[PDB]
Amino acid sequence: KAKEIRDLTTSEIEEQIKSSKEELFNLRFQLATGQLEETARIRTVRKTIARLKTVAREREIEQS
RNA sequence: UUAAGUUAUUAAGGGCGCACGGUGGAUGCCUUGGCACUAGAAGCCGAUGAAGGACGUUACUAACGACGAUAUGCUUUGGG
Ligand SMILES: [Mg+2]
Numbered sequence: 570k571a572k573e574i575r576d577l578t579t580s581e582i583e584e585q586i587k588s589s590k591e592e593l594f595n596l597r598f599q600l601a602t603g604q605l606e607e608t609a610r611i612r613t614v615r616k617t618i619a620r621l622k623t624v625a626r627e628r629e630i631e632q633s
Numbered sequence: 634u635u636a637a638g639u640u641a642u643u644a645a646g647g648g649c650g651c652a653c654g655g656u657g658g659a660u661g662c663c664u665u666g667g668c669a670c671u672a673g674a675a676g677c678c679g680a681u682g683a684a685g686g687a688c689g690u691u692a693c694u695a696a697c698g699a700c701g702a703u704a705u706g707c708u709u710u711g712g713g
Pocket residue numbers: none
């Protein structure tokens with residue numbers, strides 16, 4: 570997904586980070602209430618956030 | 634029939650031999666780990682926060698390895 574992230578503006582990366590952290594929060598609450606059963610979504614969102622923060626840092630290090 | 638004399642049978646248990654079991658982990662075979670060296674290289678890191686740790690990170694969860702809230706991992710360049 571790193572290629573897809575790389576085409577987003579910096580603010581959009583920040584917007585996707587927040588919404589991904591919101592989806593991840595919702596998945597954990599579903600899991601704790603025994604309602605998710607689709608447990609592979611948790612790791613997918615987690616690594617997506619990692620990729621989003623990786624690129625944000627990359628560009629914040631190319632600018633400075 | 635009696636008298637005199639002689640000598641068995643028993644095995645509660647024991648002994649010896651034999652047969653069949655149990656226990657135990659010697660012995661043989663084996664190696665995942667060691668021991669002693671040879672050759673080439675390297676030896677010491679730290680306020681740009683070390684050595685060593687604590688606590689955490691996996692869908693489930695104790696310990697160990699790995700990793701650090703980007704956590705049982707992220708990007709990239711090559712290999713495969
Ligand atoms: Mg008897």
